[PDB]
Structure 1
């Protein structure tokens, strides 16, 4: 329950495809490098201040440092050793003591062996050392954000308004591979505050043209909410905006305007404006400090502008990474060549395989088979594998009568019954109930009435005028209070129906009512399906940036048949920003019990797809969650020990894959085709991992999902696990498309997001309250309410 298994073999399925990856080969010298520890007092100074201190120090004590790199905290590295036995030094800032002592030697050669087959595991300390080398210069030249670097783009202004603009940048990371050390580079963009005078900032915030008396309370509060917490220089952080203008704002030995008239001989041009409190500064003498990322949520218009800047087709992104690398010229970096490192300026060539899609089996009389082409099929001339007969249903229209008329509802109804009959999900008649209502208050009594009145009620269709709190209320009552199936539809999709939208709607409705839309062609499935097997999907979703006390939400779903198609869900609230699923053992236990009730089999194998865990968390997560899965098995039955396969799925990494031949580019966005698999060259030197781009990239540059096997009792071959994973991407019921992650992992997301809706404005006694809020009704417990 600890060390990840070795790669068993390499995959062989699928035709080959030439690819380019945004990985750049590194040539590392075979020398010892030297690690030193650095203590600085005081030790709360920002990482950038620490970097500053060291670099002025290094160029000070040259002849006592005969080009060291620094990680901004405690670690310093040199290519050739120092004369230095601990030493304590003295430096001066634009009054620091720096402790510099030798701790160890880092051999890059040892890393060379780990990249070879000689060493089983890559020595992390070597990788970190290389990362610090590659990060030293851009950490002082640019503005660091995570593993990325941002700067104002020379020659261009990309304003967002409101005092904000777009900074362009890039992600940078160092990683081992089957081939060589690789520099992973991707381009990015993010919102920064303009380094403008506060006066101009005021005008952009308050939508002023020039500069238009003292400020309205509404003007003062808006400007206060925009600048509070930001840094300004004439270096201060703004904590408040005064209520009084500089004319009258007073401080004990006496106004602000008079102090500046007297001491600095400065007569304020706009004394009618309030002061920033940081002790008060007039707006006129203050600039917004450059390089402050905008943490706050962007406006709708700012988002739109941002999208129209970070939106690039695959070839466009490919070209921009390449142009960045050729302009970056990593090989002229003084610290890089100091350590004898050479970075290749061209993308690494990789050979991928394009896996064949499974056939999708439908039902009805014809029992049609659909063949995915480039990640997409459709349901024309096809019926559900198991279609639901809808006898008793109701409509609740919360949209206004004037806009969503009885004629609209009638026309929507007839169109839906037509599409649903074609799909093999016959809606046998008119609804038994159809009424208008308004506001969240009407939801609960209306649904109780429906439940008490109409025996065998199967569904409530709910018409919503658009974004409204009524939706959350409908799901609260439907999912957790009364246990009733609901399907919501936006008014505009009732007013104007299309075959495609109605058809997609029927996919969800059939599923919600217990139907089977389609199944993988049974004979086309990998050998693992010969024995009872349960597929688990797990995810944790964390609160937005800046949030302080909202819980994280853990969701786990499990397959309930052999197709696999039907899933049951479990969900939990847990500690703020904790990734480890705390109550997993209980969740899996529930799923195993439900599996046995549905199939009358005990799983001989458990396949666990775990979404969103980064490399630095692998061992911690695996340790708790693998043991949790075992615990669930143990407490169920004596010596019940099914084989566990633990797979981490990452969609949000920085690996991009491009077609080498423009002949292979698919569609407008020019992405790699669905099914493209990579398990050589750029993947892990010893462990079992692969990229699988399972979906059609219709938009921008596709994110190829990465799969990392942390544990495998079942000893999968590369081929079977890759094919299995790909096939599970075709089992997602909400669309006739191969999706970007396997359906169980995707369902886990939907469950987590539904719980978040159950918690809107509700997030010991605290925990029990929130836990109760996400607990679904007994009747809902065994349904796909999350669809």
Structure 2
């Protein structure tokens, strides 16, 4: 059917003002007509075929069009302001490059206007606006994929050795409470720099060529750079042609004082044309597609990761130079936009109190800005360690330094709040990287032959800087068909022992061997709404594409805390959004219809872990497209509703889908960038910033939470589009729960951007690549299934 309508606008925290990149764009007021396109001969050739329509319009603008300028979609559509006098006419025009093309224009149907005004979901107004913007793009700028751009909107910075910056925008048209908002966001991509060939080559090779003899390496570099670059001949001014470059010659010019400069394969191999260098010019249309060295990489990254003030100013400059007003298409079409950034008055939620073990000189810690250290504190649950062995997989690290690091980690784990028994069961012996299977069963079975059945609890395994499938084999045979827990580190970290490194790996180990580390005061004192009254299992999900498209699910496993997330991973058909593996019913001869999947074998785990069935499910889906919400919301919910009625009949708790999307471009900036509204360090809105006002989907329920601190660049807010709910969650309730929950992250001592339930699913679906060998994945041994093996 439909989704869950928005219940209201919540109120919490300290209200403030944040400005975003959403330029208001009023829909036009003139009638629009749709005319089909039919061209013979029929070939795709989209760029060339658009020129056919352009020439047709230019030739017949007064004869038949009536001085009105049509809007051309390209592939199969065409739009016009008003109605043209004719209804069907045929004309033939030819591309200037020879086979003439005949085109017929006819009227088929017309969705005139106000198909989204009544909505504020027929996307006809959005589609027409997108078509108009794309026509403007193809008319004025040079498109490269979807983020088209051109210079003179900013001074083109020189990346180096003949490259150019050419910053530009990546717009989209999206319905919003404002009404048909425009979404200018800037993306940068290097382009090739026009220049006289002499100095161009001189700066490309770093030295002048006239004063030095030619060399093989210079020729290789020149041909690699110039393979595919367009060139314009300036030898004859009257005649100019778009001569393509096929390669570099291997013959001197003697076959213009530059005698030693070889010519080029002008045209192609069949047309052997050889001409000197200084009688030509470089065309700027093409884009650099080859590799960029790690000098130009840094030079370009300095531009695309500007501070948010420098980004909002650039975004505001893009439109003020785009000049949508006094533009022929808008004037003849009626489209009008604004030129100032959208202003909203969203509010900053407060950071939640966190409580630690009764020991330590402080049992409480509130995240000051959004990040807090574990100094002077201790974890809630410390899991004791009795048996553990260290295997070294490198030659640089010796028996002294490896054991020293391994003991420093143990001391750090002791001081962080768990027992770590030193003096390993089997001493390190620096196994060879090649005999991986032999070493990894030798270490496991030496204990069984020595300690009499005391299975290893933590097999430490230092590995070299470059994996080379060593990580894959190690942490594949270390959990498949051989149950174990590994905490592999890097050689470049063992020598550089740092307190932060040790105290952040200790946290992972403690949460990795069956325990928990931090918990909110509210969830343990029973004050979080809708989470602490009946048992809530906050799921997660993810689908990663690369070869089966593996997918993961992670659940919750306890009442007072929501910190432990054990989950399952599987494989299905290739490259599809929805996951068909949630509920599977194979046929059993002796039994009936055996029910499996993840949302059965993961609820059974919850029952075994806490003692009682869960009476509220929050499936918290992640990583889905913006247009196929419906199919996911259908299948991923029908699978749950059919699986829950299989373990025990008449049991269906209220689910609450919340799809999370981070791959969007709607930034948020603090209103006053000259005060402490930002984080006063690497400017950005304060960690925690819910924007549900004036930038959302008007008849739906979503928010642009920004719960993560911004270390560098502009923080990209997460878009928790809460699709379907049956808990009657308060709109402030979801915002408070989601901001308050992303502070219980295991590996970190910070607040993640996308929250742990939808972030663990991205790790469990990423680790299974190494396990992979429709083909079934190797079984995960029961030894590590309830214990978080990834985070």
Q: Name 2:589's counterpart in structure 1.
A: none
Check the 8 A contact 2:394/2:433 in 1, yes or no.
no
Among 639, 646, 653, the residue aligned to 1:628:
639
What displacement does 1:16 show?
Answer: 0.8
Q: Name 2:81's counterpart in structure 1.
A: 79
What displacement does 1:685 show?
Answer: 1.2
Q: Name 2:663's counterpart in structure 1.
A: 652
Matches within 5 A, 1:296-375: 298-365=292-359, 368-375=363-370
Q: Name 2:687's counterpart in structure 1.
A: 674
What displacement does 1:689 show?
Answer: 1.1
What displacement does 1:361 show?
Answer: 2.7
**Please, which moves more after superposition, 51-60 or 633-642?**
633-642
Check the 8 A contact 2:213/2:260 in 1, yes or no.
no
Distance (Å, rounded) in 1 between the aligned partners of 2:531 and 2:201? 64
1:437–1:276 CA distance, 2 compared to 1 (3 A) = farther
Q: Name 1:431's counterpart in structure 2.
A: 424
Q: Name 1:492's counterpart in structure 2.
A: 492
Matches within 5 A, 1:337-736: 337-365=331-359, 368-401=363-396, 404-437=397-430, 439-454=432-447, 455-469=454-468, 470-521=470-521, 522=523, 523-543=526-546, 551-562=548-559, 563-585=561-583, 586-662=597-673, 663=675, 664-736=677-749
Among 750, 761, 767, the residue aligned to 2:763:
750
**Please, which moves more after superposition, 625-634 or 711-720?**
625-634
Q: Name 1:101's counterpart in structure 2.
A: 106
Give the 3-state SS of the residue equivalent to 1:619 in structure 2. helix
What displacement does 1:157 show?
Answer: 5.2
Check the 8 A contact 2:399/2:428 in 1, yes or no.
no
Distance (Å, rounded) in 1 between the aligned partners of 2:152 and 2:481? 54
Which of the two has greater helix per residue? 1
Give the 3-state SS of the residue equivalent to 2:381 in structure 1. coil
1:402-458 Cα offsets, whole Å, 9 max, x none, are xx3444334423432232112112212132334353653233222211211222311
Distance (Å, rounded) in 2 between the aligned partners of 1:712 and 1:432? 52
Aligned-CA RMSD value: 3.4
Distance (Å, rounded) in 1 between the aligned partners of 2:574 and 2:214? 43
Give the 3-state SS of the residue equivalent to 2:493 in structure 1. helix
Distance (Å, rounded) in 2 between the aligned partners of 1:421 and 1:583? 42
Q: Name 1:547's counterpart in structure 2.
A: none
Matches within 5 A, 1:234-245: none
Give the 3-state SS of the residue equivalent to 2:378 in structure 1. coil
1:604-626 Cα offsets, whole Å, 9 max, x none, are 33222222323222223323323
Q: How many residues align?
A: 744
Matches within 5 A, 1:58-69: 58-63=57-62, 64-66=64-66, 67-69=69-71
1:548-579 Cα offsets, whole Å, 9 max, x none, are xx553322222222321111232234455433
Check the 8 A contact 1:555/1:571 in 2, yes or no.
yes
1:100-138 Cα offsets, whole Å, 9 max, x none, are 2223333443422322xxxxxx32122101221233212
What displacement does 1:78 show?
Answer: 1.6
Give the 3-state SS of the residue equivalent to 1:492 in structure 2. helix
1:318-343 Cα offsets, whole Å, 9 max, x none, are 11111222222221221122222221
Distance (Å, rounded) in 2 between the aligned partners of 1:205 and 1:317? 30
Distance (Å, rounded) in 1 between the aligned partners of 2:578 and 2:275? 50
What displacement does 1:151 show?
Answer: 2.2
1:229-280 Cα offsets, whole Å, 9 max, x none, are 8878866989x879xx6679xxxxxxxx99xx9xxxxx99766878996746
Check the 8 A contact 2:688/2:739 in 1, yes or no.
yes
**Please, which moves more after superposition, 171-180 or 624-633?**
624-633
Scaled by the length of structure 1, what TM-score is found? 0.86
What displacement does 1:516 show?
Answer: 0.5
What displacement does 1:6 show?
Answer: 1.2
Give the 3-state SS of the residue equivalent to 1:97 in structure 2. strand
Distance (Å, rounded) in 1 between the aligned partners of 2:477 and 2:323? 60
**Please, which moves more after superposition, 468-477 or 20-29?**
468-477
1:246–1:101 CA distance, 2 compared to 1 (3 A) = farther
Structure 1 spans left out of the alignment, 5+ residues: 116-121, 249-256, 262-266, 544-549
What displacement does 1:733 show?
Answer: 0.6
Give the 3-state SS of the residue equivalent to 2:148 in structure 1. strand
What displacement does 1:504 show?
Answer: 0.6
**Please, which moves more after superposition, 530-539 or 295-304?**
295-304
Check the 8 A contact 1:197/1:287 in 2, yes or no.
yes
What displacement does 1:777 show?
Answer: 3.5
Which of the two has greater strand per residue? 1
1:581–1:194 CA distance, 2 compared to 1 (3 A) = farther
What displacement does 1:739 show?
Answer: 0.8
Scaled by the length of structure 2, what TM-score is found? 0.85
What displacement does 1:162 show?
Answer: 8.1
1:46–1:301 CA distance, 2 compared to 1 (3 A) = farther
1:532–1:298 CA distance, 2 compared to 1 (3 A) = farther
Check the 8 A contact 1:32/1:106 in 2, yes or no.
no
Distance (Å, rounded) in 1 between the aligned partners of 2:339 and 2:483? 59
Check the 8 A contact 1:693/1:705 in 2, yes or no.
yes
1:140–1:199 CA distance, 2 compared to 1 (3 A) = farther
1:133 aligns to 2:144 (yes or no): no
**Please, which moves more after superposition, 278-287 or 447-456?**
278-287
What displacement does 1:472 show?
Answer: 2.6
Matches within 5 A, 1:6-405: 6-63=5-62, 64-66=64-66, 67-94=69-96, 95-115=100-120, 122-152=121-151, 158=157, 165-193=164-192, 210=209, 279=270, 290-293=284-287, 298-365=292-359, 368-401=363-396, 404-405=397-398
Give the 3-state SS of the residue equivalent to 2:16 in structure 1. strand
Distance (Å, rounded) in 1 between the aligned partners of 2:275 and 2:574? 41
Q: Name 2:237's counterpart in structure 1.
A: none
Check the 8 A contact 2:405/2:494 in 1, yes or no.
yes
**Please, which moves more after superposition, 575-584 or 287-296?**
287-296
**Please, which moves more after superposition, 691-700 or 163-172?**
163-172
Give the 3-state SS of the residue equivalent to 2:177 in structure 1. coil
